[PDB]
A paper describes a structure:
A plant called Arabidopsis thaliana has a light-sensitive protein called ZEITLUPE (or ZTL for short) that helps it keep its circadian clock in sync with the cycle of night and day. In Arabidopsis thaliana, three LOV domain containing proteins ZTL, FLAVIN-BINDING, KELCH REPEAT, F-BOX 1 (FKF1), and LOV KELCH PROTEIN 2 (LKP2) act in circadian timing and seasonal flowering. Recent research indicates that their divergent roles in the circadian clock and photoperiodic flowering may enable interrogation of how chemistry regulates PAS/LOV protein function to select for signaling pathways. These proteins retain analogous elements, where an N-terminal LOV domain regulates activity of a C-terminal E3 ubiquitin ligase to target clock proteins for degradation in a time dependent manner. LOV domains are typified by blue-light induced formation of a C4a adduct between a conserved Cys residue and a bound flavin (FAD, FMN or riboflavin) cofactor.
Towards these aims we solved 2.5 Å, 2.6 Å, and 2.1 Å crystal structures of dark-state WT ZTL, G80R and V48I:G80R (residues 29–165) respectively. In contrast, examination of V48I containing structures reveals distinct differences that identify allosteric signal transduction mechanisms to the N/Ccap. These mechanisms identify V48I as a residue that disrupts allosteric regulation of ZTL function. V48I positions the additional methyl group into a pocket adjacent to N5, C82 and Q154. The Q154 conformation is not heterogeneous in V48I:G80R, rather, the Ile side chain sterically directs Q154 to an exposed conformation near O4 that has not been observed in other LOV proteins. Density shows clear selection of the I48 methyl group towards Q154. Lack of density for an adduct is consistent with minimal population of the light-state species. Thus, the presence of G46 selects for a heterogeneous conformation of Q154 and V48I biases the heterogeneous Q154 towards the exposed conformation in the dark. Introduction of V48I, directs Q154 to a single exposed conformation in the dark. Biasing the Q154 to the exposed conformation results in disrupted interactions with GI and high TOC1/PRR5 degradation, in vivo, consistent with selecting for a distinct dark-state conformation.
Residue numbers in the entry:
A (entry chain D): 16 to 135
B (entry chain C): 16 to 137
The structure:
């Protein structure tokens, strides 16, 4: 039961073009609120948080950004938040998708969400 | 400008869970009309035909299901039809997506539509 995301890798800043119903149900963000955004909003603790939360690991975020910049897959884990602010550990897999011309047209995201017992 | 498709590889018979705008524009089918269905409907001539049309290459259709069954990529070309029944040549690439526990959870479809000489028309 994993979250599934698609970004457009040609448009700047990997805008989301699809999220599955698991993403929606687990994160509390409905598709209409998310398509056209970069996924990094999940690192903010709910919609009033304008900044990445100090508990999401900036070393993992750096590594994601590098894997995307380099056109390679990523696998790791970082803290995300539901729309209502509850914390969620996200075991994230990114997979670049090739259209034809040896170019990356899309990136697929797989999210395996893990409940966390932390007090914020 | 490719069509882009996602299916659920865990649910039975690869129901479509996403198509992009290019798919909609080129095939003439809106997302609402195709979600939850297998893509094979594009091998039928228009929305009211239930079985794959004879001019569709059954050898290629066979190789597509083989690739899906084996969980490997597919690349190839086949005849499809728009919602208005006009023929399409679809250069299709399929890519399985591995979720957790080394399992395929989804398949991605890239459609590059190319011109055919195929013409059934009046
Ligand atoms: C397909 C895809 C899925 C992503 N899914 C998530 C996610 O579920 N949670 C998250 O925190 N970041 C996710 N990201 C990462 C952010 O979009 C962004 O790449 C990351 O924060 C690094 O960039 P930045 O330093 O500019 O924020 C995803 C990225 C892509 C391309
Ligand atoms: C992700 C994905 C995208 C597909 N896209 C198309 C398509 O655009 N056109 C088409 O004729 N078949 C497409 N198919 C194939 C059909 O769904 C079906 O797998 C094919 O006809 C072989 O299976 P069948 O003999 O049971 O019909 C796609 C399949 C998958 C998994």
């Amino acid at each position: 039961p994993c979250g599934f995301i698609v970004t457009d890798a040609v448009e700047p800043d990997q805008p989301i073009i699809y999220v599955n119903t698991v993403f929606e149900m687990v994160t509390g963000y409905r598709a209409e609120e998310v398509l056209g955004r970069n996924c990094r909003f999940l690192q903010c603790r709910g919609p009033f948080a304008k900044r990445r939360h100090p508990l999401v690991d900036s070393m993992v975020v750096s590594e994601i950004r590098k894997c995307i910049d380099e056109g390679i897959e990523f696998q790791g884990e970082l803290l995300n938040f539901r729309k209502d602010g509850s914390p969620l550990m996200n075991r994230l897999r990114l997979t670049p998708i090739y259209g034809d011309d040896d170019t990356i047209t899309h990136i697929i995201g797989i999210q395996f969400f893990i409940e966390t017992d932390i007090d914020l």
